[PDB]
Design a protein around this ligand. Sequence first.
Ligand SMILES: [Mg+2]
Ligand SMILES: [Mg+2]
Ligand SMILES: [Mg+2]
Ligand SMILES: [Mg+2]
Ligand SMILES: [Mg+2]
Ligand SMILES: [Mg+2]
Ligand SMILES: [Mg+2]
Ligand SMILES: [Mg+2]
Ligand SMILES: [Mg+2]
Ligand SMILES: [Mg+2]
Ligand SMILES: [Mg+2]
Ligand SMILES: [Mg+2]
Ligand SMILES: [Mg+2]
Ligand SMILES: [Mg+2]
Ligand SMILES: [Mg+2]
Lengths: 191, 195, 109, 139
Amino acid sequence: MKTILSNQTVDIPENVDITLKGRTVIVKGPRGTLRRDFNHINVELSLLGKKKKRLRVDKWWGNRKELATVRTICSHVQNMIKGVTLGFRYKMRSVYAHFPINVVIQENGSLVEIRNFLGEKYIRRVRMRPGVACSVSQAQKDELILEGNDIELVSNSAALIQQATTVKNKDIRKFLDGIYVSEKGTVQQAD
Amino acid sequence: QVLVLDGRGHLLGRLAAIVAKQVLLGRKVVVVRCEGINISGNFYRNKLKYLAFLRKRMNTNPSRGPYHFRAPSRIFWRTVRGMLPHKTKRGQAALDRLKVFDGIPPPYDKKKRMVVPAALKVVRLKPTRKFAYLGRLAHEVGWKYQAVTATLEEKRKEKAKIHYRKKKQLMRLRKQAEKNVEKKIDKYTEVLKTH
Amino acid sequence: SGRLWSKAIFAGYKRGLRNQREHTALLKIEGVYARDETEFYLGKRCAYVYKAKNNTVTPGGKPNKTRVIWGKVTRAHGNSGMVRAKFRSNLPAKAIGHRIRVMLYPSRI
Amino acid sequence: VFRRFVEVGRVAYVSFGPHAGKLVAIVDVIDQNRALVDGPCTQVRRQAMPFKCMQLTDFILKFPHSAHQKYVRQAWQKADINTKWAATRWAKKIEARERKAKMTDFDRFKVMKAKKMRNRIIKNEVKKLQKAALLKASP
RNA sequence: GAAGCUACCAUCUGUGGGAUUAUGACUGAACGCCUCUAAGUCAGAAUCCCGCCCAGGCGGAACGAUACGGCAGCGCCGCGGAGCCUCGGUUGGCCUCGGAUAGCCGGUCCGGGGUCCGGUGCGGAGUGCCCUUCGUCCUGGGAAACGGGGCGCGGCCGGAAAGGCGGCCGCCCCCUCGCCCGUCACGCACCGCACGUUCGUGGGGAACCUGGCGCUAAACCAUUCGUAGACGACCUGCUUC
RNA sequence: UAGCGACGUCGCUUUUUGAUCCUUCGAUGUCGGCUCUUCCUAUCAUUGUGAAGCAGAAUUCGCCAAGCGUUGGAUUGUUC
RNA sequence: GCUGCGGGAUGAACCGAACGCCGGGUUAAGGCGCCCGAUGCCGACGCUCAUCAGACCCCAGAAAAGGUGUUGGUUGAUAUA
RNA sequence: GCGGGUCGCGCCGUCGGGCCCGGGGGGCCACGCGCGCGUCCCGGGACGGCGGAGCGAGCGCACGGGGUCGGCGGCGACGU
Ligand SMILES: [Mg+2]
Ligand SMILES: [Mg+2]
Ligand SMILES: [Mg+2]
Ligand SMILES: [Mg+2]
Ligand SMILES: [Mg+2]
Ligand SMILES: [Mg+2]
Ligand SMILES: [Mg+2]
Ligand SMILES: [Mg+2]
Ligand SMILES: [Mg+2]
Ligand SMILES: [Mg+2]
Ligand SMILES: [Mg+2]
Ligand SMILES: [Mg+2]
Ligand SMILES: [Mg+2]
Ligand SMILES: [Mg+2]
Ligand SMILES: [Mg+2]
């Protein structure tokens, strides 16, 4: 109905800094830096506050789908702020059948090697994203921890793991086996 | 005489309409950077329509009959063929006058390229609608020459930077000369009569 | 010394969609791109300059290989600023996409 | 980014239409496309003109919402738009385009001879400056 | 039963990359939550396209040889003279990549950040430059130390996608009216008339006389050959050791 | 409502048959088989998938999908 | 049928309009991105994203039914108790 | 009390009667003064005819005038 401006409000803490040269957002903090492009959306990104760091995501007339789109920018900015302050940690318990799954890492946590795979002999190799690391958890049976900064990269690596572990040509209600995502959280907790 | 046109950021049908109208009058027009001509719609739809165009072929002999070019310059040349009366010696002479190129040739590196405002993506299309690249479509179907054309394009972009730095240096020098004194006697005439 | 004639391109004949009328010709003249701009050229005289290997010439000093079918501007045509013209002899139809001089005489300067 | 915007109380140029080259002032926006404009001293009558028909400027005025012609004229004469509008480069650009439209052949002859003299002096000075730059960079 | 043809009747070989459909997903609003989607990202196959494999276009490259003999004939440079054919314009623009909810210019600091300008663009194609210069002579004001064209010489390659003009240095036959402002006098003033002034020392074809540098062959037929053949066509040999 | 679906109702096809006579009566050679090339999908199998009253195996229903296969025979002139 | 002409790309019946040979002006039916004459008006409002979009009487294709895909509209029901 | 016709008074209206009897700038294709022929009106205006009375005549010219003329002007050879 050609609605006049919709503005989303983002507070940015003093631990991190934001910089925009246009629709490109560059957020640099304690846990590295992270930059993304919002080129294909055409929504104004303004900021204010002398060491107060108030971001505003403003869109004029638009349409209903574009008023739906203007909140997505605010939510991904919140995701980037959480990833640069705390980071993302996905904990995946290996829900395993009669045959256990042997999960190791090869290339410093960037190559997950899967073995014994419901009795299938084929050793499986999954290459992760540049910017996410992998580990096998301690004090817990067959838990796989993926740690990173970007939620899209970490969750796409977890999606690649849970789709590489997939029961094929069977009733998949039976044979409940695969590496599924158990817990989603941050690296630095209690915040 | 010659009309050297950019292709970066133009639309296929609009640019073909303006070129096919201006080539019948005698102005020798050449569309350069044909791999960057945008096409409206979805890219899956554009390659589906081009796949249907490939499917259209003579079944008794595919050679004697429909020819299906994969290079984007020849795609645009077929687009202008389908608009000019090419079966007569008016559109045939117009297609002889028309020249098309992928990348940029070395004379057209030196000669200045024109940009048609009536055929631009930004002027004609809504900015929240999908689009495609004709060079991307050509590399996806048939035309295996993106890696050579892009390399030569980066080479001529480096040449254009190393020329533009010298041109901007000379412009700074001539504006220092204009900043200097004892030229204003003619400027008393010129500022009154349209500096 | 210097060109005294404005540039116009012979575009075609007065026609419908099927049939033509060769008595009136169409000129896309440069500079004019508007109905309000094709007003000053009403009354100009045009000239199509072509070549032939025999010798039928003007008295301008020496004989040459130049032949001209004369004519003049009749009226305007379209919103794009096209110019109708009735020449004294009809067009050879080779002149499509070619140039016809528009000289700046009897108009009302 | 977005330094200008339509506003209750903003002067705006008119490029296309029957009132071309005449400043108007936006009073209120009717519905998304047209605004009730008014002219106190720019010889244009109070009417509704489209936004794509007008052209936005930078100067603002303190109009009340839907005020009279009298209050529009008082805010215009308080803000002094005419002298401050003559004292900018944009009106000089429009005035130069009008003077080029109002040239004559004798004026073009004077412009061409001054053009030749200035370009000869500029060419000699650019040659002298690049010679001095080479003489400076040679040690 | 030799040679040769032939047999899944003997033997050998048949090969990978991309975008993606269906589908399963990631982030994430619409719609506080949810969601594979609305903008965005991932995996994805006998499908599709290309690779590999065939014949290569009224398609283009690089290189060799380019006509002896006794008169000959033929190329490159710069030449003056005439003449037949063909058709088109009457100055050329020697260039930033990229965006359009953004971008241009100038500039201390370590290609980036801060700062200063301009912005319906004037560091602009509603533009810039030799330019509307018919020419000559005298005489003066302003600008001008590069001189200003080159039958010029020598070095550099600038540029490889379809390249030939431009820049620097040292001299040369010379020019200080190579341009704007003023004075002077003339050149066809062809007495009212068109196709006039142009990148033209225009494109190619046959010959005429002169200067210098050079060039001294190759196909096709005939014959032979079989790895080839309906006929053509294809691969081949020919020295006096 | 996995798979089915009566009583009713809405469509597609010319792979059957029917209806008309519009072309053909100074002729368009009339069945089947053999051989041979191409195309379609309303998919039998193979490749990638979803759903079952899918535990496995074996089946059924669907989607993208015509690239490649889709027999040897006794009978009948056979189409069947 | 016995009938040309301008549109419907092509047409026996459709839409205008009926025909001696021509010049000028105008118009119907129709159209003005290129073929192919004409919107190259700084045309106005709003709808539509369609992995089978859509594009003008006869005319050369389509229904019952369904959609939290978007746009209006009607009847209602909640909410500072 | 609600309707139909008529009469009498007042208020308007660049209204109509060339509006008139008598008084205190512009336009009109509108004209024999002497005096005497009838109608109308208050010595004067309109009309048929006569008392005045269209008296002298087509002289020349321009014609937005029964379908244009110039009493306007140029230019070229032995291969056009
Ligand atoms: Mg099973
Ligand atoms: Mg999907
Ligand atoms: Mg019949
Ligand atoms: Mg029949
Ligand atoms: Mg027969
Ligand atoms: Mg037959
Ligand atoms: Mg097949
Ligand atoms: Mg009959
Ligand atoms: Mg009849
Ligand atoms: Mg017709
Ligand atoms: Mg039709
Ligand atoms: Mg007519
Ligand atoms: Mg047209
Ligand atoms: Mg039919
Ligand atoms: Mg609905």
